[PDB]
C-alpha cells in the first residue's frame, strides 16, 4: 500500500468530483447493519457441485461452469424437479 | 527504465495542471460575502436545504470557472432539485435562458418533468416522448429561438 | 391415469380474506401440457396382479371387485 | 387419490437446499420479532422456488420480477406500504428502477450476492432511503466452500477499492473552506 | 435576441400554463391513486 499514489488520485479527482454521503449529511437517519450467514450444502447440492467441478477439467467454459455452480448453490431443483411418482 | 521515468513525469505534469485548477477553484470558492455567494433565484419558488444550497453554489462556481464536474450525491439527496435550481439561477441572473438538454431514464422522464413543473413553471419544458410521428410533429418549428428552454429525452 | 389432484387455491388470492380455510399454492411455472419420460421398475408379479385384480379402469366395477 | 398418485412433499424443497433452511429459520425469527423482510435474488427461477417455499411456510408475499407493468409496480409498492399482512416482497435486484419507495419494510435478505456491489447498495437504498423510521438490517447468505465465497470476496474487494478511491478523499466543500 | 423584460413577460404566461397543467396532473394522479386503493362490491 502506497498512500501517496492514493492521495495523488484524490488530488486529480478533487476539482471535478463532489461527493455527499447520507451519514455525514443527513444525521436524522436510522442505522444500518450487515450480516454474513454461512450455510452448508445438502447431499443433492454436494453431489451436483462435485460433479460439475469434476466436469470442469477434461468442453464447457469457465463461465458456463461458473453459472451452473451458481444455479446449484441456489437450488438443485433449478436443474430437475423431484419426480411425481405414479403407477405404470 | 525510461518507460517508468516518462510515465512518472507525464503523471506529474497532469497532477500539476490539476493542482493549479484545484487552487483556482479553492480561491474562487473562498470569496467572502453560511457565506454562500449565490442567492436563491426569485423564480425558484421553493425552499432548498443547506447542502442543496451549497451544491447550487458549487454548480455556479463550476459554471463561472467553465469546468465540467460530477455531482456524486448519494441516492435521494435531491440532485434533480439542485440541477433545476442551477438552471433557474443561470437563466435569471446570467441570462442563460438558452435551450438546455436533460437526458434521463425513460422511467424518470415523467418524474423529472413533474419536478420541473413543480419548482420552475417559468421554464418552457419540451418532452420528447412518443412515436416517430409525434416526435416529428413536436420537432416541427423548433429551430426558432425561444421555442423551448428545457428538453427531456431518454 | 386420469388422476386429478387439487393442490390448492392460487396464491394470488391469499390476501382477499383473513380466514378462508384454504391451502394456497403458487402458479405453476412450466407449460400447461408437459411430457416427461421416466423409467418404471416393475416385476412380472406386479403385472399379473394388475391384470388379475384390476383397478385401473376407475369404473364402478373395479371398486366393487 | 393417495393410492393413485404420490406428490413429493413441499418439505423436501427446503431439505434439498441449506439456504432454504437457514432462510426459514431467519424469516420465522424475523416475523416473531415483528419485522418485514425484502428478499433479493438474481434469478427468477429462484424466485419461483422462493414462491413455493414461502407459500408452503404460509408467509404472505408479493413478487416483482420486472415483468409487471409500471403502473402495476406502483400499485404493488403502495399496497406493500399500506398492507401489513404481506410479510415479504421477493424482488429482482436489477429491476424496479428508482421510483420504488418500500420504506414500510425494515429488513433485507440477499439470497445471492451480485458481483457489482453498487447493485446491492441500490437494493439496500430501496428501503434505507430518507423517510424510513426503523433500523435496517442486511442479511447475506453464502454457501461454504463454493463459488459464493469468491463472489463475496470480489464484492468486498470492490467495496474496499471504492472506499479508497471515492471515500478516501474528502471531495467536499469543507476541504476547500478548510 | 429577446431581452430580460420580454423573458419575464413570457415567463408569466408560461408559469400560468404550467401551473394549470400541474394542477390537472396532480388531480388526475390523486384520483387514480384513490381509485386504486378503492375496493367495492354489490349488495
Ligand atoms: N428541500 C426539499 N423541498 C422539496 N422537495 C424536496 C426537497 N428535498 C428533496 N425533495 C424531494 O425529493 C424528491 C426525490 O429526490 P431526488 O431528487 O429524486 O433524489 P436524487 O438525488 O435525484 O436520486 P434519486 O435516484 O432520483 S432517489 C424530489 O423529487 C423532491 O421533490
Swiss-Prot record, chain A:
Compartmental location: Nucleus
| Taxonomic superkingdom | Eukaryota
**Any coiled-coil regions, as ranges:** none
Q: Report the protein's function.
A: Catalytic component of the SRCAP complex which mediates the ATP-dependent exchange of histone H2AZ/H2B dimers for nucleosomal H2A/H2B, leading to transcriptional regulation of selected genes by chromatin remodeling. Acts as a coactivator for CREB-mediated transcription, steroid receptor-mediated transcription, and Notch-mediated transcription.
Q: How does it assemble?
A: Interacts with CREBBP and EP300. May be part of a complex containing SRCAP, CREBBP, CARM1 and GRIP1. Component of the chromatin-remodeling SRCAP complex composed of at least SRCAP, DMAP1, RUVBL1, RUVBL2, ACTL6A, YEATS4, VPS72, ACTR6 and ZNHIT1. Component of a NuA4-related complex which contains EP400, TRRAP/PAF400, SRCAP, BRD8/SMAP, EPC1, DMAP1/DNMAP1, RUVBL1/TIP49, RUVBL2, actin, ACTL6A/BAF53A, VPS72 and YEATS4/GAS41.
Which family is this sequence assigned to? Belongs to the SNF2/RAD54 helicase family. SWR1 subfamily.
Which disorder is recorded? Floating-Harbor syndrome: A rare genetic disorder characterized by proportionate short stature, delayed bone age, delayed speech development, and typical facial features. The face is triangular with deep-set eyes, long eyelashes, bulbous nose, wide columella, short philtrum, and thin lips.
Record protein name field: Helicase SRCAP
Tell me the stretch of the parent sequence this chain holds.
821 to 916 of 3230
UniProtKB/Swiss-Prot annotation, chain C:
Q: Where in the cell is it found?
A: Nucleus matrix; Nucleus, Nucleoplasm; Cytoplasm; Membrane
Q: What is known of its domains?
A: Binding to MYC is dependent on a Myc domain essential for oncogenic activity.
Q: What is the lineage of its organism?
A: Eukaryota, Metazoa, Chordata, Craniata, Vertebrata
**Protein source organism:** Homo sapiens
What is noted besides the main data?
Answer: High level of autoantibodies against RUVBL1 are detected in sera of patients with autoimmune diseases such as polymyositis/dermatomyosistis and autoimmune hepatitis.
Q: What family does the entry list?
A: Belongs to the RuvB family.
Q: How does it assemble?
A: Forms homohexameric rings. Can form a dodecamer with RUVBL2 made of two stacked hexameric rings; however, even though RUVBL1 and RUVBL2 are present in equimolar ratio, the oligomeric status of each hexamer is not known. Oligomerization may regulate binding to nucleic acids and conversely, binding to nucleic acids may affect the dodecameric assembly. Interaction of the complex with DHX34 results in conformational changes of the N-terminus of the RUVBL2 subunits, resulting in loss of nucleotide binding ability and ATP hydrolysis of the complex. (Microbial infection) Interacts with Mumps L polymerase; this interaction regulates the viral transcription.
Covered residues, full protein: 197 to 261 of 456
Cross-linked residues for Glycyl lysine isopeptide (Lys-Gly) (interchain with G-Cter in SUMO2) are 29
Instruction: Output this protein's name.
Output: RuvB-like 1
Tissue specificity field: Ubiquitously expressed with high expression in heart, skeletal muscle and testis.
Swiss-Prot record, chain E:
Cellular compartment(s): Nucleus
The UniProt gene name for this protein comes to VPS72
Complexes and interactors: Component of the NuA4 histone acetyltransferase complex which contains the catalytic subunit KAT5/TIP60 and the subunits EP400, TRRAP/PAF400, BRD8/SMAP, EPC1, DMAP1/DNMAP1, RUVBL1/TIP49, RUVBL2, ING3, actin, ACTL6A/BAF53A, MORF4L1/MRG15, MORF4L2/MRGX, MRGBP, YEATS4/GAS41 and VPS72/YL1. Component of a NuA4-related complex which contains EP400, TRRAP/PAF400, SRCAP, BRD8/SMAP, EPC1, DMAP1/DNMAP1, RUVBL1/TIP49, RUVBL2, actin, ACTL6A/BAF53A, VPS72 and YEATS4/GAS41. Also part of a multiprotein complex which contains SRCAP and which binds to H2AZ1/H2AZ.
What this protein is called in its record is: Vacuolar protein sorting-associated protein 72 homolog
- Family under the similarity heading: Belongs to the VPS72/YL1 family.
Q: How is it modified after translation?
A: Phosphorylation is enhanced by ZNHIT1 and promotes the interaction of VPS72 with histone H2AZ1.
Role this protein plays? Deposition-and-exchange histone chaperone specific for H2AZ1, specifically chaperones H2AZ1 and deposits it into nucleosomes. As component of the SRCAP complex, mediates the ATP-dependent exchange of histone H2AZ1/H2B dimers for nucleosomal H2A/H2B, leading to transcriptional regulation of selected genes by chromatin remodeling.
Q: Which domain of life is it from?
A: Eukaryota
Q: Which residues bind DNA?
A: 1-41
Amino acid at each position: 500500500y502506497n498512500e501517496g499514489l492514493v492521495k495523488r488520485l484524490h488530488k486529480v479527482l478533487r476539482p471535478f468530483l463532489l461527493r455527499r454521503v447520507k451519514v455525514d449529511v443527513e444525521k436524522q437517519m436510522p442505522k444500518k447493519y450487515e450480516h454474513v450467514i454461512r450455510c452448508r450444502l445438502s447431499k443433492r447440492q454436494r453431489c451436483l457441485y462435485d460433479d460439475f467441478m469434476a466436469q470442469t477439467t477434461t468442453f464447457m467454459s469457465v463461465i458456463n461452469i461458473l453459472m451452473q455452480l451458481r444455479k446449484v448453490c441456489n437450488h438443485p431443483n433449478l436443474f430437475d424437479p423431484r419426480p411425481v411418482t405414479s403407477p405404470f | 527504465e525510461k518507460r517508468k521515468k516518462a510515465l512518472d513525469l507525464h503523471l506529474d505534469f497532469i497532477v500539476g495542471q490539476t493542482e493549479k485548477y484545484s487552487d483556482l477553484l479553492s480561491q474562487s470558492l473562498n470569496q467572502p460575502l453560511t457565506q454562500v455567494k449565490t442567492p436563491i433565484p426569485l423564480l425558484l419558488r421553493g425552499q432548498l436545504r443547506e447542502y442543496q444550497h451549497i451544491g447550487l453554489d458549487w454548480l455556479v462556481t463550476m459554471y463561472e470557472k467553465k469546468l465540467n464536474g460530477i455531482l456524486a450525491d448519494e441516492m435521494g439527496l435531491g440532485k434533480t432539485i439542485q440541477t433545476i435550481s442551477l438552471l433557474a439561477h443561470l437563466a435569471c441572473e446570467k441570462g442563460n435562458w438558452g435551450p438546455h438538454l436533460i437526458i434521463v431514464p425513460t422511467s424518470v422522464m415523467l418524474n423529472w418533468e413533474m419536478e420541473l413543473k413543480r419548482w420552475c413553471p417559468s421554464f418552457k419544458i419540451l418532452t420528447y416522448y412518443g412515436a416517430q410521428k409525434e416526435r416529428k410533429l413536436k420537432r416541427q418549428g423548433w429551430t426558432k429561438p425561444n421555442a423551448f428552454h428545457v428538453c427531456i429525452t431518454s | 391415469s386420469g388422476a386429478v389432484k387439487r393442490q390448492g387455491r392460487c396464491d394470488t388470492y391469499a390476501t382477499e380474506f383473513d380466514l378462508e380455510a384454504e391451502e394456497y399454492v403458487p402458479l405453476p411455472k412450466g407449460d400447461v401440457h408437459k411430457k416427461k419420460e421416466i423409467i418404471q421398475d416393475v416385476t412380472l408379479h406386479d403385472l399379473d396382479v394388475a391384470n388379475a385384480r384390476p383397478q385401473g379402469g376407475q369404473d364402478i366395477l373395479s371398486m366393487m371387485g | 387419490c393417495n393410492m393413485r398418485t404420490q406428490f413429493p412433499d413441499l418439505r423436501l424443497i427446503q431439505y434439498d437446499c441449506g439456504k432454504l433452511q437457514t432462510l426459514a429459520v431467519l424469516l420465522r425469527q424475523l416475523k416473531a420479532e415483528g419485522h418485514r423482510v425484502l428478499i433479493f435474488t438474481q434469478m427468477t427461477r429462484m424466485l419461483d422456488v422462493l414462491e413455493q417455499f414461502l407459500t408452503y411456510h404460509g408467509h404472505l408475499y408479493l413478487r416483482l420480477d420486472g415483468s409487471t407493468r409500471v403502473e402495476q409496480r406502483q400499485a404493488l409498492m403502495e399496497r406493500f406500504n399500506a398492507d401489513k399482512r404481506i410479510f415479504c416482497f421477493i424482488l429482482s435486484t436489477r429491476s424496479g428502477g428508482v421510483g420504488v419507495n418500500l420504506t414500510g419494510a425494515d429488513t433485507v435478505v440477499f439470497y445471492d450476492s451480485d458481483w457489482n456491489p453498487t447493485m446491492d447498495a441500490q437494493a439496500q437504498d430501496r428501503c434505507h432511503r430518507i423517510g424510513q423510521t426503523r433500523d435496517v438490517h442486511i442479511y447475506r447468505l453464502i454457501s461454504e466452500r463454493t463459488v459464493e465465497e469468491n463472489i463475496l470476496k470480489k464484492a468486498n474487494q470492490k467495496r474496499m477499492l471504492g472506499d479508497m478511491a471515492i471515500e478516501g478523499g474528502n471531495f467536499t466543500t469543507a476541504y476547500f473552506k478548510q | 435576441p429577446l431581452t430580460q423584460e420580454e423573458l419575464l413577460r413570457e415567463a408569466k404566461i408560461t408559469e400560468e400554463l404550467n401551473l394549470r397543467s400541474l394542477e390537472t396532473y396532480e388531480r388526475l394522479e390523486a384520483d387514480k391513486k384513490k381509485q386504486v386503493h378503492k375496493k367495492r362490491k354489490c349488495p
